[PDB]
Each structure stands twice: as structure tokens, then as C-alpha cells.
Amino acid sequence: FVNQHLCGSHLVEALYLVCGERGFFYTPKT
């Protein structure tokens, strides 16, 4: 796999691809 540069909704898309229907937590700060 290549390293990832992901901002905003593109990170959320990547999380879905990695985790799928297992699910995931999107946990940014302030």
C-alpha cells in the first residue's frame, strides 16, 4: 500500500474502505 494524504470527507471514505461493515469511529479534535 502507498502512504495516504487524506483530508475531510476523503479520510472518511478511506475509513469505510478499510473497515467496511465492521464499522469505525471518526474521532477528530476540537
Partner 1 sequence: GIVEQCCTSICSLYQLENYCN
The residue ranges that bind partner 1 (CB under 8 A) are 1-8, 11, 14-15, 17-19, 22-30
> Which cell goes with 1?
500500500
CB of 7 to a copy of itself, least distance (A): 10
Instruction: Confirm if 7 and 16 have CB atoms less than 8 A apart.
Output: no
Phi, psi for 4 (deg, rounded to 5): -115, 135
Restricting to residues 1-30, which ones interact with a copy of itself according to CB under 8 A?
1-6, 8-10, 12-30
Q: Is 29 helix (H, G, I), strand (E, B) or coil?
A: coil
13 binds, among partner 1, a copy of itself, none (CB under 5 to 8 A by kind): a copy of itself
